[PDB]
Design an enzyme around this catalytic site. Structure first.
Site, PDB file in Angstrom:
ATOM      1  N   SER A 142      35.778  33.428  29.427  1.00 10.33           N
ATOM      2  CA  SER A 142      35.348  33.697  30.795  1.00 10.33           C
ATOM      3  C   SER A 142      35.061  35.185  30.910  1.00 10.33           C
ATOM      4  O   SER A 142      35.963  36.011  30.743  1.00 10.33           O
ATOM      5  CB  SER A 142      36.405  33.265  31.804  1.00 10.33           C
ATOM      6  OG  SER A 142      35.884  33.286  33.121  1.00 10.33           O
ATOM      7  N   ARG A 143      33.806  35.524  31.204  1.00  8.02           N
ATOM      8  CA  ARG A 143      33.404  36.924  31.219  1.00  8.02           C
ATOM      9  C   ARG A 143      34.000  37.673  32.408  1.00  8.02           C
ATOM     10  O   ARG A 143      34.135  38.900  32.367  1.00  8.02           O
ATOM     11  CB  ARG A 143      31.876  37.018  31.213  1.00  8.02           C
ATOM     12  CG  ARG A 143      31.349  38.430  31.136  1.00  8.02           C
ATOM     13  CD  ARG A 143      29.847  38.520  30.982  1.00  8.02           C
ATOM     14  NE  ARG A 143      29.457  39.916  31.113  1.00  8.02           N
ATOM     15  CZ  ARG A 143      29.488  40.791  30.119  1.00  8.02           C
ATOM     16  NH1 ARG A 143      29.869  40.414  28.906  1.00  8.02           N
ATOM     17  NH2 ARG A 143      29.146  42.047  30.342  1.00  8.02           N
ATOM     18  N   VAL A 144      34.403  36.963  33.460  1.00  8.11           N
ATOM     19  CA  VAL A 144      35.067  37.650  34.562  1.00  8.11           C
ATOM     20  C   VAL A 144      36.477  38.049  34.143  1.00  8.11           C
ATOM     21  O   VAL A 144      37.047  39.016  34.664  1.00  8.11           O
ATOM     22  CB  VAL A 144      35.060  36.771  35.829  1.00  8.11           C
ATOM     23  CG1 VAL A 144      35.847  35.492  35.605  1.00  8.11           C
ATOM     24  CG2 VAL A 144      35.570  37.541  37.040  1.00  8.11           C
ATOM     25  N   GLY A 145      37.043  37.335  33.170  1.00 12.38           N
ATOM     26  CA  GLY A 145      38.286  37.734  32.538  1.00 12.38           C
ATOM     27  C   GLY A 145      39.492  37.674  33.459  1.00 12.38           C
ATOM     28  O   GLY A 145      39.499  37.015  34.503  1.00 12.38           O
ATOM     29  N   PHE A 182      38.100  41.486  29.875  1.00 11.37           N
ATOM     30  CA  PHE A 182      38.233  40.178  29.243  1.00 11.37           C
ATOM     31  C   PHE A 182      39.640  39.999  28.692  1.00 11.37           C
ATOM     32  O   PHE A 182      40.422  39.199  29.213  1.00 11.37           O
ATOM     33  CB  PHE A 182      37.231  39.995  28.096  1.00 11.37           C
ATOM     34  CG  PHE A 182      35.826  40.437  28.410  1.00 11.37           C
ATOM     35  CD1 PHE A 182      35.268  40.250  29.664  1.00 11.37           C
ATOM     36  CD2 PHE A 182      35.057  41.033  27.428  1.00 11.37           C
ATOM     37  CE1 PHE A 182      33.977  40.664  29.926  1.00 11.37           C
ATOM     38  CE2 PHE A 182      33.769  41.443  27.688  1.00 11.37           C
ATOM     39  CZ  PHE A 182      33.229  41.257  28.940  1.00 11.37           C
TER      40      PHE A 182
END
Ligand SMILES: Nc1ncnc2c1ncn2[C@@H]1O[C@H](COP(=O)(O)OP(=O)(O)OP(=O)(O)O)[C@@H](O)[C@H]1O
Lengths: 51, 502, 481, 72, 247, 245, 72
Positions: free
Chosen positions: B364-367, F192
């Site tokens: 998930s790039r929003v992390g 990330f």
């Protein structure tokens, strides 16, 4: 017995690994076949009209 | 074109009767060449590029590409019962759609028409289809979490409201259970969901809408459904009309959640709609425009800032990787278009893990920015635990070893991974999944059976909230997993270990 | 409808572009017959369907019979509606080509009730909510990989392996158990195999030579002689001939399509003939929409299910390419017939391990059915693993813990073979019909381990578990002599 | 050779004749089959026959499908 | 190509003498047809050649037949483009050509010139009544040995050379000696090899292959068979090589 | 792309600064060309793109040149579609670019970020006079190590690692250490996952690569160098790894 | 450098010029080849010349062939 069982576990690892390899290579060959045939058909159809 | 479409004998009679004579047809056009779902119309010069033209039977047509004489339209309905020579009429509204808060619960047929039949929905229109996606200043970084419900997803691959996140998979391995689980878990906290199904055999979407109806999510959700047996332009338009129907609730300061279903089938409807036009295709015969397609579709789903009201629309598109190959055309396209990927592997779902999410690929790039201040620490520890276990399982230590796993990390990693499996359409609340994540994280429960960790944790879940509402209150009010919460949770799971032993 | 007198302007191969007066043109998919003429001197009419409008009052139409000899300008006449297929109780037993004329030469069909080929989809107020599985009548299917009532089913197995005896048993069982009725709708059926199937039907009592309209099949045969228009629309003809059955009598109708890939191939031919730009690998652009129109009218409406069984011939054996991909997007249960199992003689030759169904899940079947099915599949997996090693070690040499697993797997693989209601004509075995309850209890008794001492061949070619124990005690009574 | 009509078509025969040869032999064996005589027609290189049909149809401006073989 | 064909057809109609014509890169007679056909309005065929590939290729290669006044033996050097053995321009020429000799880049990779494939280079003249029973049996044994080597290539490639069978190891050594021995030092290729050209008839190489594959002289070194004119030359080369090995 | 280029060109050509322009996804420029020139009536080209995919993108690349006034250190994250470099839209990009680095998906699938392929990433500046002889020789040695690894990948296929002899096993272990060490926790990927970013200079990574390729660090396991910066920090990470056990 | 002409053609050139560059070089060396000097021409990226000729003969509607390259 220990040598032949080491060779046997090498053969089992190699057979399962070649099964994984055959599956992945079949997937690559299938997408390659679809890409080849689709490019062929696009060549043919796009060269048909030549308006 | 030598055979120009506006050269029918009857039609050119109309022009040949008046050379430089009495004024033209303002809004009256005769349809002609209404074939492959793409009618053409003579005259009708008032039509704006993108105007919504009408027909005699009552079918609606977007007027995309108006040439010199023929204003070629894309009729949205089936172009079957339309005959040549029929009159058409534009209505002066640029591809509008009537939309309101009466849609919450209905089943729309991609033309703002209810397909459930039980009533005609009224609205105040206020909404276009091809509106400009929100600007760069209007958007704000994703910060609020989204309770996806699935332990694996909301633990390691977090979805944040306003962050588009495709769930790419394989056919017949989840992704609709995963999407409906995300919708279903949104029972409590209000979001105006939109489950827009593009490619679905009608029995599947009927089953899904009935499952919604019985489990209560029909109080908010909106099933913009389009069957697999629908004209290709409707399967093309259905996600745009779903995005507009959710954007109406995004603009008025309310979080929403849209889920495009089988977005590969939508691009398939577009390659059909374009190869009927004979526009030139690219790789895998997609007409190349699929990127601009999935751009208009998926870039209009993100969180608007406090200026226009803190609204949001997570997008959760479902690209069905038919090959199993991530490096196909349209899955690669949507991966480039979206903020991450939640990969539902096929071999794991065949192997048993019911949410087939494998965290090795799914990122998930929003992390961790989108997670909760409570869950962030324990979820980071859990992700590192799964990294260790994935190495120790995928690689050596089958012979006992130097490091001798199943005694350091392998047992707990197996317990964790077999904890990650959810029951089918039974979402876990926020505090429930925080405690469940914590349990296997620091190694509290390691000497159970790896057979039935789920069959213990059902009891643990049923017990912890009924025993210690202090935990639920800590997680619900402060939203932070305190050390005090750690202690009371330790005592609760101790008493439940007692009740399990006896 | 009316004498919409038109000229057949252009005839390319099968495609015949016809013209019309400017006012009245038949809409798309509207069947028009030409008043053609045979070179032998008979005014034979070849029927056509408007597949694509071309603007200048000229509707490009494909032909459901040969165009060899069609004079340009021959009078073509509209019907105003799609191809009127003679549905009803009358079309119960005979063989039909796409336009619905009986080609077996028995007699003309009563055309009292006729629905068009192109009736549209049923809506969500029509489709049924509950996902009831389909109690077919084969123990393997109705235990290991149930068929979804109202859903699609795929028979990946080849021909000669036992597909014909399987479909015959299914048709007889649907006539027997439910109130159902089957409609075989073989698309592009190679006429030799079509006659093979018809004669096997007649010799099985599934259809009666003497009693038509009391038979249990409505054969719609897409021959391969016919132009690609016909062996594409034969699928929709079968669809509507079964849809009228379900929506007049409210009965669980079956619909056997021969290979969906053959239907998709016919669609590819007809689209390449229309000249629309071909898509990926070479199937038509409107592939998903076309075959979705074919396979979405197969749904359990609130009148009664129209559950179908569709053969699927993957080309070069890859589920990746579009046509098997857009088919497997639809299929709800896929059961492969195995050539090795057929050569062993475990009829039906359905592979117990590789056959999968999306309906096997517990909330659908029942928790006990899902548990016993998963344990049977895990046991058969154990057996496929240990079949490598019992070649070397032998049953007694390896551990007695899973020697019981090998023995129970033998008993399971034998218990799966059911004597059919059609195999009587080959061997005289009377045949047993097994509902889900009987096979569930029997498989729980076998796999739990109560029957650890019964001989294996007492489980082969038997129905219920009580009949299996009867066979075992029979062998015991003869063991004295 | 007493009983076997060898319908020969050399390669320099035009596209139509290589296209028509299987049909010609089929029309001979069809007559012999209809008058009670068991026959056996052995075609040669259907690859070459459909290739000659490909030639004549691509010359005749019919839209081509897969591998540039025509529609039918 | 048709100019050369007209010269040969005159030498077969009038002079009545067996004229040997050579055409090389006959594939260009299809490529030029493609380059003009695309312009000519004729639609494109498969992978990009002309639609009338078969008729034009036949219109050339059918005029070359022994026609009861003489015999036009011809040797076309087809250009299989990029080793596309399935390409239509060689695929329709394989139908017309009697004694096809498929040269393979994979066999020039290891230096074995000429790189004619021992397997795929096949002829309508390898029938026994036409060639001789001894010739046919020795060609059968050579081709079967090379097929065995190609089928054991994968076992050799991965699992170690020794782990295959011991009699099959004899077959592998015999196949290696054969596929080296069928290399010829040409007179016109003396500039590329550096070794003088050697001409050998059919009888000498027949007797050489007999004793090579028969296992009777399976003790010579491999490089004593490679780039050698004859079997006695190979025996002498083994002497020279074993002498310069220690010395 | 053109307006970014003109914006940078005014600050290079006129006001004479060392302008950097990070044109992101320059493939999208060629794909937009594909859209417009499919709709513009111009005849289609290779697989789908415009006919002028090597002159419009030529006009974009050729205006970015370091003139005698200033230099434009441009970075262009050109995007191969469907993960094959042989595509024409990045193929015409390869000819223009001179510090090409190919981010293969393989290394990111294995988890090694950044996923810069070590074989395929090359430069025109990897030259003796340009970078010094030591940097050149170390680059050559690490390329050799990784290439021999990728060439016996076909053997650590079907068979096992233990089939290798001693030298093959050592160069495989060295290649694994190197391929792991080529990962770095970025200074912007902190959102990330991973540690805070470690800035690594050339004078520090060149020493770590001398150390690894000199075989002196054989005592360390592979997970020591994974997602670490400097090699002293890598050795410290291995020490703490053995302490934590 | 005193003996080495360099016919240089940028990327920004109209695709006529990248089609004429190797011909320009070939003729400029042809003059020296008729002046007895053993000259040497080196083309650079001859893929790019055929690519620019593809650009040209596809902007002229002259029909393409394999790999969308033009005919000749
Ligand atoms: N996590 C799960 N646990 C148990 N069963 C599941 C789970 N996920 C899916 N299923 C089963 O899968 C079926 C639904 O299909 P699934 O969601 O797997 O694919 P799909 O989304 O329908 O395929 P497509 O993407 O082509 O629409 C249901 O019958 C359900 O029982």
């Amino acid at each position: 017995a220990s040598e032949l069982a080491a060779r046997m576990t090498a053969m089992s690892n190699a057979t399962d690994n070649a099964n994984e390899l055959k599956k992945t290579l079949s997937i690559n060959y299938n997408r390659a076949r679809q890409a080849k045939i689709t490019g062929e058909i696009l060549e043919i159809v796009a060269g048909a009209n030549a308006c | 074109a030598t055979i120009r479409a506006d050269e029918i004998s009857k039609i050119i009679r109309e022009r040949i009767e008046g050379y430089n004579r009495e004024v033209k047809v303002v809004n009256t056009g005769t349809v002609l060449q209404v074939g492959d779902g793409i009618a053409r119309i003579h005259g009708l010069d008032e039509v704006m590029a993108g105007e919504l033209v009408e027909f005699e039977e009552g079918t609606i047509g977007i007027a995309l590409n108006l040439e010199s004489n023929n204003v070629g339209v894309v009729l949205m309905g089936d172009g079957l019962m339309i005959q040549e020579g029929s009159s058409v009429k534009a209505t002066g509204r640029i591809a509008q759609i009537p939309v309101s808060e009466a849609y919450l619960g209905r089943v729309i047929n991609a033309l703002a028409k209810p397909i459930d039949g039980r009533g005609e929905i009224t609205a105040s229109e206020s909404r276009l289809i091809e509106s400009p996606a929100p600007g760069i200043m209007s958007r704000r970084s994703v910060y609020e979490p989204l309770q996806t419900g699935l332990i694996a997803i909301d633990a390691m691959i977090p979805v944040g409201r306003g962050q588009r996140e495709l769930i790419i998979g394989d056919r017949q391995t989840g992704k609709t259970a995963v999407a409906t689980d995300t919708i279903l878990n949104q029972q409590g906290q209000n979001v105006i969901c939109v489950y827009v199904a593009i490619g679905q055999k009608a029995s599947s979407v009927a089953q899904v809408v009935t499952n919604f109806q019985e489990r209560g999510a029909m109080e908010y959700t909106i099933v913009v459904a389009e069957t697999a047996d629908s004209p290709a332009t409707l399967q093309y338009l259905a996600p745009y009309t779903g995005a507009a129907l959710a954007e109406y609730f995004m603009y008025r300061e309310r979080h929403t959640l849209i889920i495009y279903d089988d977005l590969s089938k939508q691009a398939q409807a577009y390659r059909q709609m374009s190869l009927l036009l004979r526009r030139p295709p690219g790789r895998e015969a997609y007409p190349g425009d699929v990127f601009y397609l999935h751009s208009r579709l998926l870039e209009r789903a993100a969180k608007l800032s406090s200026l226009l009201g803190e609204g949001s629309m997570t997008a959760l598109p479902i690209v069905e990787t038919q090959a199993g190959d991530v490096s196909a055309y349209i899955p690669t396209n949507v991966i480039s278009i979206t903020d991450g990927q939640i990969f539902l592997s096929a071999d794991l779902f065949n192997a048993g893990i019911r949410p087939a999410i494998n965290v090795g690929i799914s990122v998930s790039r929003v992390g961790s920015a989108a997670q909760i201040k409570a869950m962030k620490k324990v979820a980071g520890k859990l992700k590192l635990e799964l990294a260790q276990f994935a190495e120790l399982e995928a690689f050596a230590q089958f012979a006992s070893d130097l490091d001798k796993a199943t005694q350091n990390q392998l047992a707990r990693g197996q317990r964790l991974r077999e904890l990650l499996k959810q029951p089918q359409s039974a979402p876990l609340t926020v505090e429930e999944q925080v405690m469940t994540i914590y349990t296997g994280t620091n190694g509290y429960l390691d000497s159970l059976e790896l057979d039935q960790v789920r069959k213990y944790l059902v009891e643990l879940r049923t017990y912890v909230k009924t025993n210690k509402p202090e935990f639920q209150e800590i997680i619900s009010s402060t939203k932070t997993f305190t050390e005090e919460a750690e202690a009371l949770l330790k005592e609760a799971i101790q008493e439940q270990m007692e009740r399990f032993l006896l | 409808e009316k004498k919409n007198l038109g000229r057949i302007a252009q005839i390319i191969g099968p495609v015949l572009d016809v013209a019309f007066p400017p006012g009245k043109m038949p809409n798309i998919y509207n069947a028009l017959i030409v008043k053609g003429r045979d070179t032998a001197g008979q005014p034979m009419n070849v029927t056509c369907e408007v597949q694509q409008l071309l603007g200048n009052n000229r509707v490009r139409a494909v032909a459901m019979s040969a165009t060899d000899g069609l004079t340009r300008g021959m009078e073509v006449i509209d019907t105003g509606a799609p191809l009127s297929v003679p549905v009803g109780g009358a079309t119960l037993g005979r063989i039909f080509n796409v336009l619905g004329e009986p080609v077996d030469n028995l007699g003309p069909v009563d055309t009292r009730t006729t629905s068009p080929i192109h009736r549209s989809a049923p809506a969500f107020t029509q489709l049924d909510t509950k996902l009831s599985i389909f109690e077919t009548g084969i123990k393997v299917v109705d235990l290991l990989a149930p068929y979804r009532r109202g859903g699609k089913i795929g028979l990946f197995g080849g021909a000669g392996v036992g597909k014909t005896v399987l479909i015959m048993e299914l048709i007889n069982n649907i006539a027997k158990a439910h109130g159902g009725v089957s409609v075989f709708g073989g698309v592009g059926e190679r006429t030799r195999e079509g006659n093979d199937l018809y004669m096997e039907m007649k010799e099985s009592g599934v259809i009666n030579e003497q009693n038509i309209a009391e038979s249990k099949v409505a054969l719609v045969y897409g021959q391969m002689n016919e132009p690609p228009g016909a062996r594409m629309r034969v699928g929709l003809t079968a669809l509507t001939m079964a849809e009228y059955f379900r929506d007049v009598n409210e009965q669980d109708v079956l619909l056997f399509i021969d290979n969906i890939f053959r239907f998709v191939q016919a669609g590819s031919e007809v689209s390449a003939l229309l000249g629309r730009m071909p898509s990926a690998v070479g199937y038509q652009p409107t592939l998903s929409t076309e075959m979705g129109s074919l396979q979405e009218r197969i749904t359990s409406t609130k009148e009664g299910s129209i559950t179908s069984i569709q053969a699927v011939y993957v080309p070069a054996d890859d589920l990746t390419d579009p046509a098997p991909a857009t088919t497997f997007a639809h299929l709800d249960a896929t059961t492969v017939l195995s050539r090795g199992l057929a050569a062993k003689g475990i009829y039906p030759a359905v592979d117990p391990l590789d056959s999968t169904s999306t309906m096997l899940q517990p909330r659908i079947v029942g928790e006990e059915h899902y548990e016993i099915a998963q344990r049977v599949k895990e046991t058969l997996q154990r057996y496929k693993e240990l079949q490598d090693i019992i070649a070397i070690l032998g049953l007694d040499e390896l551990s007695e813990e899973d020697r019981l697993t090998v023995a129970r797997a033998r008993k399971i693989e034998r218990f799966l073979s059911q004597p059919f209601f059609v195999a009587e004509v080959f061997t005289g075995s009377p045949g047993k019909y097994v509902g889900l309850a009987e096979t569930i209890r029997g498989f729980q008794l076998i796999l739990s381990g109560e029957l650890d001492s019964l001989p294996e061949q007492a489980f082969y070619l038997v129905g219920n578990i009580d009949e299996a124990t009867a066979k075992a005690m029979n062998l015991e009574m003869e063991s004295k002599l």
